[PDB]
């Protein structure tokens, strides 16, 4: 999952704050998953925890390999066709590497209290 996500997030964002930014962030950029989202960067991270629900109930994980994809001008997109939960997996990655670089970052919600403000 990682390794992948994040060559797609310095894709999208063109390089402007390292991956691990957005792995301590809000209520769900990270490991746990409570409460309302805090703000757009928050919401993205959201959309793909339930991305990730449904690529595991469709049996998807863990990866089989690498999926496929390319870092064009454009930003990233997914390659894969034929093998589906490979396309699948790689479909929830680049929507929130986009999401993410759209999303403005708020300093303020980086590594916050989630045990107070997520609950």
């Given at each position: 999952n990682l390794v992948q996500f994040s060559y797609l997030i310095q894709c999208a964002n063109h390089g402007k704050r390292p991956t691990?930014?957005?792995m301590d962030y809000g209520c769900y950029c990270g490991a746990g998953?409570?409460?309302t989202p805090v703000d757009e960067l928050d919401?993205?991270?959201k959309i793909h925890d339930d991305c990730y629900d449904e690529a595991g109930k469709k049996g998807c994980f863990p990866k089989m390999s690498a999926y496929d994809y390319y870092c064009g001008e454009n930003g990233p997109?997914?390659?894969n066709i034929k093998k589906?939960?490979?396309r699948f997996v790689c479909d929830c990655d680049v929507?929130?590497?986009f999401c993410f670089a759209k999303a403005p970052?708020?300093?303020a919600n980086w590594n916050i209290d989630t045990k107070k403000?997520?609950?």
């Open positions: 691990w930014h957005y998953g409570s409460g919401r993205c991270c997109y997914c390659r589906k939960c490979l929507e929130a590497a970052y708020n300093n403000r997520c609950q």
